[PDB]
Amino acid sequence: DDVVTFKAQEQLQRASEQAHNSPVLRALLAESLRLFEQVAGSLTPANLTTAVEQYISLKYYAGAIQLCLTVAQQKDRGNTALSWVNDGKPANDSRKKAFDERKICYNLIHQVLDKLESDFAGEPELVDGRPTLAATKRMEAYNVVNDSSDEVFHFDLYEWYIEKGWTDRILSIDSPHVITYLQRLAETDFRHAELLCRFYTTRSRFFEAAQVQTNLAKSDLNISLKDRIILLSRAKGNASVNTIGISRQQQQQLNHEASELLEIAHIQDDLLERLVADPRIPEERKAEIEEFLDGPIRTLTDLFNDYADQANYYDLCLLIFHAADFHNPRTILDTWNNLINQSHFEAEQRREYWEAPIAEPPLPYVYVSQQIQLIAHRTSLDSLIFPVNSLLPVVCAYAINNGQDASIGADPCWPIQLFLNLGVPHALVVQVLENVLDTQEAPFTGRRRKLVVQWIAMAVDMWVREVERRGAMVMGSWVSELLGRADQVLTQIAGTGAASDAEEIASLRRTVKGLKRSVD
């Protein structure tokens, strides 16, 4: 008797579906709606409510929405609620009637779209091979909403989508009325600028995203500095790739602005990062600092004076100079000398305490070498704040005046190895050691010039190694002129030394005269 049972379940399943298959209802309901839309502009809020309540009882969702939209438009046909919100919240106004009346209708639309999901909550989206009737009344409903020309309703709807946390709904909307809403809101709420930027990037309008991401870091909004760094770092990414329609010059114009601010913001961050963790600063001032630094990005003037220059943060002072295109060879160099000395000082401090130091601390020249590499890699070997013409001699002078050599087990040629490995051109290092070997300005005097030759011997050695591999054969007579002139220095030092290195010197001559052959 399973056959008789199926026919019993069939009639019941058909009885439930009946109310919707019926063409009488579809005709009655459509007729009641037609009559309401006639006197739409004269409906009392009490009647419009009762009507929507009854329409929902009968699963007439999409139609009830169309009544409320119609009563809205017909209560203010001149569209004053647009002129009200578009001008933006004119308080003490007669156009509060338009919005207040239109919203009584909009609140009912929300009621429908809520009861819509409730009745057909979790119900299936697709009958085997066909959409459900639940999904049809759903499709009918959200077609009325998204197609409407009443955009004040769309704004009130978008405000209510957000207030309900329906994020993915805003993004999925293909209307162009939503972008106007987010713009008016992104400028005063960070939570909304997030959407406007996420809307643009799904459309692949990356420039329009970086355009907002950048303008947000420059904002007066309560945003952390490290977040502002992210914004400017994403904007530089969104402004790195082509987007349909936008030029190359305006694209680079925005990438450059983002890169400028990002460079400062990293300085400001690394400054704030060090200032708070600096034991020399009073704990009371540190609270006043972070409130001033964390937040918007300040001028390089503010970063430099009240903080970086006082604390004698010579490394960040140089980074500020680079970011400010600060043309002054003296102050740039004076800061490099202080940076090296203060670095040598701290590193001799830690080694003395390790004689608290956690692990074997680094020798002075190692720590000084790190502090240089950090500025070389961060600023890309500028010709201004990294002037090899002056800085390399200073490092070579410090390597003598503070005895960072074989005496402590250090590579005597560590100042050359430092600049070569940093990317400095071989031809330039030798061009400096040439100037050091002749002038004989202290400390580069007397028998210590023996070490100047060592620097030249390896420098030129590291250069002939690079050209054999390079495949070339600027190096010329002038390098041979130097090695032969550097040979006289080794003999003039071998005589006045009559020293125990008399055999070390002799061994170097056999290396020099060999390099001269490789060049000639």
Binding site: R285, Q310, F326
Partner: peptide, 17 residues
């Protein structure tokens, strides 16, 4: 741009009056 002004600053090593 950068503008050094060693004249009038705020003492970085003391709390405020």
């Amino acid at each position: 741009k950068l503008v050094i002004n060693k004249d009038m600053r705020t003492d970085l090593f003391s709390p405020p009056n």
